[PDB]
Design a protein around this ligand. Structure first.
Ligand SMILES: Nc1ncnc2c1ncn2[C@@H]1O[C@H](COP(=O)(O)OP(=O)(O)OP(=O)(O)O)[C@@H](O)[C@H]1O
Ligand SMILES: Nc1ncnc2c1ncn2[C@@H]1O[C@H](COP(=O)(O)OP(=O)(O)OP(=O)(O)O)[C@@H](O)[C@H]1O
Ligand SMILES: [Mg+2]
Ligand SMILES: [Mg+2]
Ligand SMILES: [Mg+2]
Ligand SMILES: [Mg+2]
Ligand SMILES: [Zn+2]
Ligand SMILES: [Zn+2]
Lengths: 301, 78, 302, 78
């Protein structure tokens, strides 16, 4: 079976929501912008980062979004972008789907109001990653992790290592003023298990770190930056332009944005990561400028 | 008994500052990660560690084994 | 639905929209977060960057926003954040004020649906910068320029040099993949006239560059990044935390974010800039280890 | 008669590449800015120019006067 692909127009008129996007051809940045309509992206966590991420992808005209979150909108979330006070009490995925369909009815949505880490849900989650692509039965092009805990990150990690699914992970610090994105191509770059954070490594329940009546700080600025760089990386990856980052940090205090590349641990705790590394190493072993006006005789040494 | 030394660089600071740590070889590397994080004033629990070349390290091993597999030059990812 | 809040509270409950913001005190990032309520910010241009900028400041609980834009929402703007398709045809400032008041009813708004560069409007614009602060008759704390043309930038420049008003300027490139922010403290850092772009310097009417039936490219990603760094700079400036940037660029193609510091031109074309530089140099010449709770393994720092 | 040389660095590229331009001193600096921008493939119209130390330059003056006031080392802000 085929999926139909509709025609995105270049026409520069007030009524064309894709006019300023299709202008990326004319400006020579992206030769085949309309290809965005052919991709499906799964987003786990539609909170601070994930909601803005979903909106940015919706506005770009992504073919399909799959949203996973089990939480509800609260007024305490109103310091972040996207959700509005009248949506308080709704499920994040239902609120998001409604707003996003209004924003761009060309985008397909599939949403799941559940916790991806539990026994009941995990297999459905993996089924949706594998079969929830633009054409049913094909995988999603990318998974984006916008969750706020290591257990959920490890779950996505396990799933993607098993499926050989490329994904990107985002995080924001508890003090609100730093964040990062990372690209995980299982076998090619470090998985989350290759270099676990202290708490995961020391087998400490992350729940034990949470004192009641205290929350993480968050800022709409940091969310916007992190979502922006995440989705920019997504566009660069899917539409093949610019340089894809394997890791990009953000330190708001001093405006430092480090790039890095994390390489797989050959003795990674996740056996599928190890297997993927094996497959990867096997597969590996197998102008002159014109000046229209130069009447003053300037010359380049 | 025997000690190993690590030069740990903080990747999230533009100055890329480092700390050199002397560690009894039987110390679990998790305790080194913690010590380094505290030194750099970044949260221990959420910090990870990689080699200078960017290879992921699992810190649930002795300092000694980390040293043997990876050398002394490491980078903390807060 | 949200209710007005008189005193900004740290209380960590689901119903407190300031809980995750006030947590910045506890975490020792910003000691006096609540001070945000005491400031007023003027935003010129409520488009791609300006709309998100207004939202971020509204969500933070800024005391007052003044919005200036003369344009209407169009569907062609739907590739960018903030505005929704049903708002097409409304004025950007009216649409924005309505959404933003719903988002945070604590924030005061004053909006102006006019072109700030015209002879009729310019004086009103300056009056509002000077008197449109949180208390009527006091100036705004900051002007933010989120416009898409040099004429409007030069207008804000002229006004701020005259008033001695600190402002920040943002821009995004025509190819959608680069942007920047800049802090202008008249006299202390470069004004827009200190180092004018080619078109301004060559006295070319920028209108002449614009071919009908071609538009600039824009991406919601770039808008989000640029607005995010702009408002981050605003918070750092107003709430005195971290390092304020005088210039911060963004090059999306290669993920390069250059910082710079632009210094005033002593022979700047704008005489008020020159005057401000003079006052500044005068005022300058007249101015006066780690504890580890648990170290049972005897790790030592060389 | 006289020529002046400028070393112009592109501030928007992480490599910070430069171009050295030889300019007849009477050339309006606006034409140099344009030439530099074209060399770096960034839009001429929107580009500005500052000194290596970050001082703003008004390019509506001769190359010669720019050289005399600022030297040869400049930075283009696209
Ligand atoms: N196992 C999971 N399955 C699905 N979604 C998850 C899972 N773990 C976390 N998330 C989602 O990640 C989202 C993003 O985190 P974010 O911190 O912005 O929301 P929040 O937790 O509601 O905010 P706050 O931390 O201020 O309470 C949350 O909506 C959360 O429900
Ligand atoms: N002189 C001015 N006075 C008030 N607002 C202005 C002035 N000049 C520009 N603006 C505003 O700056 C805004 C930001 O530009 P932006 O490009 O995002 O919007 P746009 O021009 O409608 O979009 P597009 O360029 O795709 O048509 C516009 O809303 C514009 O009307
Ligand atoms: Mg919640
Ligand atoms: Mg959370
Ligand atoms: Mg318009
Ligand atoms: Mg415009
Ligand atoms: Zn691994
Ligand atoms: Zn000046």
């Amino acid at each position: 079976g085929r999926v139909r692909i509709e025609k995105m127009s270049s026409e520069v008129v007030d009524s064309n929501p894709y006019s300023r996007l299709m202008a990326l051809k004319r400006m020579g940045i992206v030769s085949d912008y309309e290809k965005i309509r052919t991709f499906a992206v799964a987003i786990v966590g539609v909170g601070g980062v994930g909601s803005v991420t979903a909106e940015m992808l919706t506005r770009c005209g992504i073919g399909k979004l799959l949203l996973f979150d089990y939480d509800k909108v609260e007024l305490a979330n109103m310091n972040r972008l996207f959700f509005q006070p009248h949506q308080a009490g709704l499920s994040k995925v239902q609120a998001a789907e409604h707003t996003l369909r209004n924003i761009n009815p060309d985008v397909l949505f599939e949403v799941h109001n559940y916790n991806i880490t539990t026994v009941e849900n995990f297999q459905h989650f993996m089924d949706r990653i594998s079969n929830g692509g633009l054409e049913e039965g094909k995988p999603v092009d990318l998974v984006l992790s916008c969750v706020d805990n290591f257990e959920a990150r490890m779950t996505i990690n396990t799933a993607c290592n098993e499926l050989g699914q490329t994904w990107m992970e985002s995080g924001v610090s508890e003090n609100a003023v730093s964040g990062h994105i990372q690209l995980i191509i299982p076998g090619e770059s470090a998985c989350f298990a290759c270099a676990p954070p202290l708490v995961v490594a020391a087998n400490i329940d992350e729940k034990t770190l949470k004192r009641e009546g205290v929350c993480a700080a968050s800022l709409p600025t940091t969310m916007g930056v992190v979502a922006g760089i995440l989705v920019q990386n997504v566009l660069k990856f899917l539409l093949n332009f610019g340089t894809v980052s394997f890791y990009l940090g953000y330190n708001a205090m001093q405006d430092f944005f480090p790039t890095m590349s994390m390489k797989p641990n050959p003795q990674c705790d996740d056996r599928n990561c190890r297997k993927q590394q094996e497959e990867y190493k096997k597969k590996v072993a197998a102008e002159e400028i014109i000046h229209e006006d130069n009447e003053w005789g300037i010359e380049l040494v | 008994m025997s000690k190993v030394s690590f030069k740990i660089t903080l990747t999230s600071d533009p100055r890329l500052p480092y700390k050199v740590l002397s560690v009894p070889e039987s110390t679990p590397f998790t305790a080194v990660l913690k010590f380094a994080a505290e030194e750099f004033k970044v949260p221990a629990a959420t910090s990870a560690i990689i080699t200078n070349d960017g290879i992921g390290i699992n810190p649930a091993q002795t300092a000694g084994n980390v040293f043997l597999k990876h050398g002394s030059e490491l980078r903390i990812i807060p």
